[PDB]
């Protein structure tokens, strides 16, 4: 494996595709489209469950940035996963009860002319606000809580 | 057309002009155009050559591919052909009745000198000698 | 990177952190400096050169200098301050000055050969200067 | 045959953030850049103009 | 990255065709920037492979933008989960996909069924109607099983779109079947030949 | 064959049938149409499961190779085409006649394929190499 | 004179579409009907009566 | 022997055909100018790695007339039956 910064630099430099130095890559960028349904599928399959704030995934990516595939298959120990979602059920019901007013977010979340974010600049070092997690009681749950 | 082609006299013309050693300098490398501008920050590392390009007046620079392959207006071909036409060769005298050939560079007298047989057993391949004379 | 490991840094961390924070400062510049006036290869080379240093620093601190224990060294590998796949090479006899990983790889070359920069660069040629395409390494065997 | 290597300017103390090398090497004597002087420039200077006069 | 990549790929196909009078916005709506003539309409109409890819990328942007809004810290944990739940059932609306895939409506109905399944049990008790049911995972899965089947279909369709675009259209001689309309005139040719 | 009784009618073709062969090695029946289609019929379901597409006008003979899994069909368009009856792949086109073909017969030894044509020639074909090497021109018609 | 509504006085010949013997030319487009079918052969059983079994019987 | 010969050629073809749908060479060069002192060369072939993303390289719907027929076979008829006035 090799430094995560490399795909940032490649994707950042190529990204406009007006770059005419990169124009030779344009041919490969088009052909990658054939796989793009497969890249979407692997991305959404991996998506972080609501008790995770950040998930690090392994990706397989083309040396020109042409396409990024997520190489994980997300496996779970299903009694743990049913337990984890069972705690989300408890917590999500509690919040909907307690909130009084719950502001559902707007869709699309960004305007049609708003370009996608600079992630290394914008997202990378704003620290995430905490996820949905139940307060496990370390006396009753100490087999599991840590 | 080339596989069948028969004219041994034409083949032997080509063999003389062809040259007999491979020219690797034409094989080997490209020229450093940042060095032509004069600014090659790569300089010791460079791959490409750091030497004078061919001047743009020099028509040998111009040659396309198709002109070369089809063989029309090919500058290097014309240079070769002009020297081949310039190359000296015999044309016989205007006196039609002359049938005499001077021969020279036979080497010195002694064991290095060719015998009469060495002329007899070769030049009679071409035609009937009427008289033969040697001046050692 | 510390959020990724949940446990807090072990005892040594005050010693390495001033340096490790400077390597991050370098890497953010190298990610972002303009991609013009440099070859299509050259723009990537700062990323690998800083990555090599940062791993070499953590590696030298524990192995050469012993100034961090095991627990902080292994913490650095788990945090991903250190390229520990690459460090596994530096431990090897004959690779102890290696540049990146991609130059050892062989399978990504055309002819199935390691990169040129390996080639005991003393042996290679009388005068040949080299900057291999993967990371600009001039020769990493001696 | 039947029966020195050029010296390098090494800074390989890994803590020296902004200065280090340890397989990145310019030699104690090296040309990083090479250029024609002015006489060789003036020969090449006319060449690019002669290419542009074709237009 | 996958959205940048997906955006650039479709945007490059537009430029490859040289349809510079179309604009693909960052939410993957394909708008025509001017009134097309006739010939620009004939040239630009290109839907089934391209739009189903484009709409799957639209869905992906809705999902990833929800996570982005969370990571910025302007949508907390619960509003993301309700966002993700909403996106998967209500994707029938936000999916322009329904048009091209129209068998896809099977999945829209099945997420509607799951929504009723979850909401009824989730609301049961002192819990009000309206937003907040963040239990996205049952609906999420339905779209992954959709994407399983569509992945080879679109890979084949996009391979045919890309290949004819690079290779050119080879239809200048393949055999044509003889279905309804052609049957009546085709009987005389084979009769007259016989 | 003995009673003369009728016991199927198979309604898949579109305009006319005129080729039938029953395979001597598979439970399949092949048929060719003036509707430009060659069909494979499966004599374990009586449904159709293969179509061989490439003929440009009416099929009018077909033969089923006695030992390979290979099928050959004649049509107007003045060719015979060779098919692989497993994959539907077409892997010869015996162009070389100049007028509509309608007879083909196959045999295991060379010439594996023999074709007869309204150009008043018979041709003998090298089924491996796909070339012809006879033209038996002696017919006037 | 009308003549563009011609009958087939001069029919075209096969062996010249995509890939017909050209097969390196064959092209990467192939999608709809060709792709998926019947990849395993059904050989007829022994005892189809025909050449050797019929002689075997009277 | 005939049936086995027929399949074995097309089989090797079909595998490359669906794909369409160390190893060395010793080269003896008739051009005797040669590599230094060597009447032959021995040379390593490797295959260019196909980029699995790159789309088809070239336009191939180029179309040209049918190749000329193989030279005519003699026509070999019996002599014309003349049937002139009444038929
Ligand atoms: O999708 P939500 O935002 O969770 O809203 C739903 C949805 O409302 P809308 O589709 O009108 O936006 C239901 O409708 P269906 O999608 O199931 O058709 C609706 O049911 P009604 O059709 O009866 O209005 C129901 O409201 P209700 O609880 O009154 O059934 C309400 O569900 P929640 O109130 O629990 O969100
Ligand atoms: Mg119609
Ligand atoms: Zn240079
Ligand atoms: Zn190296
Ligand atoms: Zn390296
Ligand atoms: Zn290297």
Swiss-Prot record, chain A:
Disulfide bridge map: none
Subcellular locations according to the entry: Nucleus
Annotated signal sequence range: none
Quaternary assembly: Part of the U5 snRNP complex and of the U4/U6-U5 tri-snRNP complex.
UniProt function note: Functions as a scaffold that mediates the ordered assembly of spliceosomal proteins and snRNAs. Required for the assembly of the U4/U6-U5 tri-snRNP complex. Functions as a scaffold that positions spliceosomal U2, U5 and U6 snRNAs at splice sites on pre-mRNA substrates, so that splicing can occur. Interacts with both the 5' and the 3' splice site.
Domain notes: The MPN (JAB/Mov34) domain has structural similarity with deubiquitinating enzymes, but lacks the residues that would bind the catalytic metal ion. Contains a region with structural similarity to reverse transcriptase, presenting the classical thumb, fingers and palm architecture, but lacks enzyme activity, since the essential metal-binding residues are not conserved.
Protein name, per record: Pre-mRNA-splicing factor 8 homolog
Designated gene of the protein: prp-8
Section of the entire sequence shown: 50 to 195 of 2329
UniProtKB/Swiss-Prot annotation, chain C:
PROSITE patterns associated with the record: G10_1 (PS00997), G10_2 (PS00998)
An annotated GO cellular component: spliceosomal complex
Claim: Endoplasmic reticulum is one of the keywords in the record: no
Short motif (Nuclear localization signal): ranges: 3-7
Disulfide linkage: none
Keyword Cell division in annotation: no
Compartments, as annotated in UniProt: Nucleus
Single GO BP term: mRNA splicing, via spliceosome
InterPro entries: BUD31 (IPR001748), BUD31/G10-rel_CS (IPR018230)
Family recorded in the similarity comment: Belongs to the BUD31 (G10) family.
Subunit annotation: Identified in the spliceosome C complex.
Name of the protein in question: Protein BUD31 homolog
Species for this entry: Caenorhabditis elegans
Gene: bud-31
UniProtKB/Swiss-Prot annotation, chain G:
Domain of life: Eukaryota
Cellular compartments annotated: Nucleus
Biased composition (Polar residues): 25-34
Protein family membership: Belongs to the CWC15 family.
Known partners and oligomeric status: Component of spliceosomal complex.
Function (record text): Component of a spliceosomal complex that is required for activating pre-mRNA splicing.
Official protein name in the record: Spliceosome-associated protein CWC15 homolog
Species: Caenorhabditis elegans
Residues of the full protein shown: 1 to 58 of 230
Swiss-Prot record, chain H:
Region feature Disordered, mapped onto this chain: 54-87
UniProt record similarity statement: Belongs to the SNW family.
The name this protein goes by in its record: Uncharacterized protein T27F2.1
Organism: Caenorhabditis elegans
Span covered, complete protein: 147 to 244 of 535
